[PDB]
């Protein structure tokens, strides 16, 4: 029966509030509910625990920024002054001694935030892969905010899709995003083509690496 | 100092079986109940098992029932789960995590987790292992003394995910950066390790990248030449 809903990604500018809300169903508009916050890339931790009556019970560690509020069947987590360790994925936890109940769980991101270009880095294939009869050309693309790039590959003008393999972007350490592009061939492609080319596009500038054989 | 050490996840086979493991130390382990909390790749949190302090009452959720077995001993303070007749939904990332409230000895209880492990990761796939090859990314022709030059290892062709990457035993942590893997339309993952070093420095230190396998055993030690 215990069934809670929860609201759609979040959305706030640097430092200003964000409200986000765990609903519970019907029967159970009386109960508790514990956040956890996964921010990107790591394990979840415990936030803190509100329930019906208004009491809240937090978690030894988190900021202070965190507050909980309730109405009815409704379970707010509020984040004033938003930042970006505060940025992540936060789920929902109901229990009834008999089972646990998890949220559908809301993404928290800031937005309005400037704007960061892409350095990317292009490898050609070592020569113990072109010995061993193949070739990945490696593309790595780090420090861009925000995480949505496009990536194109080139034999010497022509545009190439065969063999491409590019990853999501994620989060890193300084809270910028990383993705990676592989190009498989043969080495006799390799060996034919002037340059292979690896192009970057992202919020409108689209840069481009370039190696060939040597 | 809480910490929950779990072990035991793996590749294994669709109907096979797997046994994991949380020690938990820095607390009275037996006063809580513990959990199992499993996490698909690119999904949700799922509860999965519970058990009580004493160890006599247990809660499973109904996609699991039956199936999985969790157990306890105390003289240990190890929480275990026996997963048998596994199958693709299974695979993920469990967590064993910690009531934060105590109750009565024997006797039936819940509570909101206070406390999460880093998890460990089990595979269920009928594909294998393998261990990747290593190959050297070596600094581009294009390095003059005096800038910034960018050398790597790629580790291509591995089954199943993590490989760690070290450089130079451990001592080079500065400006290395490892790529989260790509997982190839063949299914098979890859991925690389990047360090950015003054270009004078090549030729003077060399540089080797310590990459680790566990699923297959392999530990491979690649020095990168300039060319």
């Known amino acids: 029966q215990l069934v809670l809903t929860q609201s759609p990604s979040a959305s706030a500018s640097l430092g200003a509030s964000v409200k986000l809300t765990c609903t519970l169903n019907?029967?159970?508009?009386?109960?508790?509910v514990a956040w956890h916050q996964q921010q990107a890339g790591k394990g979840p931790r415990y936030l803190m625990t509100?329930?019906?009556?208004?009491?809240?019970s937090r978690g030894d560690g988190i900021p202070d920024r965190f507050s909980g509020s309730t109405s009815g069947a409704d379970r707010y987590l509020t984040i004033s002054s938003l930042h970006f360790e505060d940025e992540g994925d936060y789920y929902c936890?109901?229990?009834?001694?008999?089972?646990?109940?998890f949220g559908p769980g809301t993404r928290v991101a800031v937005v309005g935030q400037p704007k960061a270009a892409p350095s990317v880095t292009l490898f050609p294939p070592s020569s113990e892969e072109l010995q061993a009869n193949k070739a990945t050309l490696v593309c790595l693309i780090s420090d861009f905010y925000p995480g949505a790039v496009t990536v194109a590959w080139k034999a010497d003008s022509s545009p190439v899709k065969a063999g491409v393999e590019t990853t999501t972007p994620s989060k890193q350490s300084n809270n910028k995003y990383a993705a990676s592009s592989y190009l498989s061939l043969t080495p006799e492609q390799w060996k034919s083509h002037r340059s292979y080319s690896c192009q970057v596009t992202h919020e409108g500038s689209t840069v481009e690496k370039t190696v060939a054989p040597t | 100092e809480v910490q929950l050490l779990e072990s035991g996840g793996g590749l294994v086979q669709p109907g096979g079986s797997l046994k994991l493991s949380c020690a938990a130390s820095?607390?009275?382990?037996?006063?809580?109940?513990m959990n199992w909390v499993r996490q698909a790749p690119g999904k949700g949190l799922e509860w999965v098992s519970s058990?009580?302090?004493?160890?006599?009452?247990?809660s499973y959720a109904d996609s699991v029932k039956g199936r999985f077995t969790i157990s306890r001993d105390n003289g240990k303070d190890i929480v275990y789960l026996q997963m048998n007749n596994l199958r693709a939904d299974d695979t993920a990332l469990y967590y064993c995590?910690?009531?934060?409230?105590?109750?009565?000895?024997?006797?039936?209880?819940?509570?909101?987790?206070?406390?999460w492990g880093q998890g460990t990761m089990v595979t269920v796939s009928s594909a294998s292992t393998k261990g990747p090859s290593v190959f050297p990314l070596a600094p581009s022709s294009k390095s003059t003394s005096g800038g910034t030059a960018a050398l790597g290892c790629l580790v291509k062709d591995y089954f199943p995910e993590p490989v760690t990457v070290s450089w130079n035993s451990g001592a080079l942590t500065s400006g290395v950066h490892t790529f989260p893997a790509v997982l190839q339309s063949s299914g098979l993952y890859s991925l690389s390790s990047v360090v950015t070093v003054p270009s004078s420095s090549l030729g003077t230190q060399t540089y080797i990248c310590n990459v680790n396998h566990k699923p297959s055993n392999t530990k491979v030690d690649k020095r990168v030449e300039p060319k």
């Open positions: 995590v910690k009531d934060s409230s105590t109750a009565w000895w024997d006797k039936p209880a819940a509570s909101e987790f206070d406390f």
């Open positions: 019907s029967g159970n508009t009386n109960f508790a």
């Open positions: 820095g607390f009275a382990v037996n006063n809580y109940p």
């Open positions: 509100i329930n019906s009556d208004g009491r809240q």
């Open positions: 936890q109901a229990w009834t001694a008999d089972l646990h109940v």
């Open positions: 058990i009580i302090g004493s160890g006599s009452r247990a």
